[PDB]
Structure formats: C-alpha cells, structure tokens
C-alpha cells in the first residue's frame, strides 16, 4: 500500500548549461525517503 522513494524525482531546474560545478537550487522537489502510495 505504501512504499519508499529512495533517490528519485530530481529534474532539471532551468535550461542553462553547466558543467563540473556544484550548483545550489531552491525549488519544489520530492523529498528523499518519503512515503509514496501504491495503487493497483
């Protein structure tokens, strides 16, 4: 019925090319290790 959401649901915040950097993003994300409902 419920399950775990390890490290999933990360997207690209914008359309600016970046390479070999460590950018900090503030946006709406799916938090790690949250509980997701299972439907069937």
């Amino acid at each position: 019925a419920y399950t775990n959401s390890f490290t999933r649901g990360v997207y690209y915040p914008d359309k600016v090319f970046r390479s070999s950097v460590l950018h900090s993003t503030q946006d709406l994300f799916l938090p790690f290790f949250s509980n997701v409902t299972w439907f069937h």
Binding site: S20, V21, L22, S24, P31
Partner: protein, 49 residues
C-alpha cells in the same frame, strides 16, 4: 552535481539529516573530520496575546 557532459549525477537534500546540512554548508560531498557550525535554533511563539 553536474559532470563533464553537463548531466546531473548526484544530489543532496539539505533538510533530511544533520550530515546533509553539514554537506550543504561546506558545499562538498565528502566531509573531513571536525566540528562545524551549521545553523541556529529558536523556539517559536505559541500564541498571540
């Protein structure tokens, strides 16, 4: 964490646990041995009067 090809290969959630907030303050994924100031805390007011 981007790479040579400009693709995201890793991330860190900066409010999961204390080690993640340490990693976000130092802006790295490996942390050397030490003690690090990361945040503050403060109790919020319960109601108005």
């Amino acid at each position: 964490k981007y790479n040579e090809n400009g693709t995201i290969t890793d991330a860190v959630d900066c409010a999961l646990d204390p080690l993640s907030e340490t990693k976000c303050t130092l802006k790295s994924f490996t942390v050397e041995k030490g003690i690090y100031q990361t945040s503050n805390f403060r109790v919020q007011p319960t109601e108005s009067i």
